[PDB]
Amino acid sequence: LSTPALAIPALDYNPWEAIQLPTTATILDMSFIDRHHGWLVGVNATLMETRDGGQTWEPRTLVLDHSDYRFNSVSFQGNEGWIVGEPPIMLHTTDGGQSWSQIPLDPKLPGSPRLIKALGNGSAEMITNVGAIYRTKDSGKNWQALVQEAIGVMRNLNRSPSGEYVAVSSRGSFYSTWEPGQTAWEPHNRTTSRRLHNMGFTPDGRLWMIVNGGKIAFSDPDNSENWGELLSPLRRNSVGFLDLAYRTPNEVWLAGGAGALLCSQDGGQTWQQDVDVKKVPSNFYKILFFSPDQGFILGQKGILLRYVTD
Template identity: 45%
Template structure:
């Protein structure tokens, strides 16, 4: 697998075949799906407030009610829950807004979920891509990113979509079936340019709308670790796993957690290989990411939260007490250098106002029976928490 990444030009893996490049590229437009005939949507909060004294109704019945384009529920503390037109069981995975219009955004998830908002997230409408629906695959859309009006979406099985008109139409970019690993992350970096990462550690960059890609690393993570068994990385010998999570800093550096959580890896622009690191904690790592000040945060399985000492890449961390109630924390999102939110299992929400030194529990989602997987702040005024069962919270602060 490592040999697939050694070439400086990956035309054979990622570029459009010559026969396709000579033809005009097909363009696909979103087609709104038929709306439900129901005139209203009944939320759990609305039911509990107005109907518990008269009619018993099971959760199964509630989740089977027809869905409409989403509207905001009553405010939950500093967050409000938005009802979405998605099936029960959908896991929301990523969200992005058009930089020139922060009212216009897209929401991705499993089961080929793709929603669009034009009012800042108050209401969402389901969209579809005809070229994807005509196939037998049920795509999992993993990542979305915008730079100006240009946007990119990647998913599994391998699919790459590109827009130059803020999502009014999407063009499907052909990809090789021999691409190493599954595409898990994409970042729009400039005009016609993007950076893409697979769960096997391949990093590719393009500057011509995705028709040609260049490898930013010389080999896969498996090849790097198996070649450097003497590096002393615990659990890294004969490594054949994949990334569990990967996060990018504003300056283009990456931190990724191995699928078993027994070590982590980093990469900085210009480095030929990923750099493995032993974990500095006893429990296995759940997720890692970047603080607003340039340091790292680290989550372990079982609910522990650690902050790196200083900024930049390091192996020195110190634990920070958190009130996780025994539930695992799954992600952290920084709104500013001082304020950040952590989210996790069974609706756990934690807040810090001092950069992460101390955390307090916010009861906003205590009654939401869902795991909260991702905290995304678009800017200081707009933030979202994404979870399973179609749970989406919007920041009100």
């Protein structure tokens, strides 16, 4: 017993600085106009703006009919930005969020908005909480239905660079994929007994999954429906993971409950723990990298971690 028992090695540098936002509401999403100017959104109609790359954030309160909205998603492409939330709401800007307008949503939308993606120049795509997919090309005046066959309330949803999506079923029994041209989601059975929690895309054309009990896997490069070995980054089942994101093609971060944050420098094969952030009293729900030297992790109760290059 000459090395610490049951642990994984501790990372040599902690790049994450903890920030307390001027709120205790949960933050759900973030998007940048450029390197310095960006927006974040969350629960209770929370909206904040940064002009310094996300070091400091200023609350903005829109005078809406009520403040119970859960702002689920924000997306900018240059100065054009969009926010969606539940109960159904859509906000739009063309000036970097200096003025926002509410876009009326068709009451026949199946489910409430879950995700919006700005495509620039008046175009955007929206997905509802039950997987209906719509696109606008005219700044939200008209929406074309791409998928109307609903799939139940998705547990998680992620997008690839080419506009594919992957959605985990409500209770993690299976997952579904969609790409442009398809008229419905395609279901795929899970490949572990443990239920799926989250799935997304790697920067090399594969899928990743997080499953119950702190395990992860990656799809086969030759066949995205074949899956590799089930990995245990923390060598245990007690700590669940919530999100996985790549800073670079080889450097991967894995965020989970109760201060858990791990990094792999070999593409996800082996992991080391960022022990400094174990002191932060928060689950780490979402990792957002905007470039290799700008990134954020969403905690609870207004906690943010901000990436600071060594």
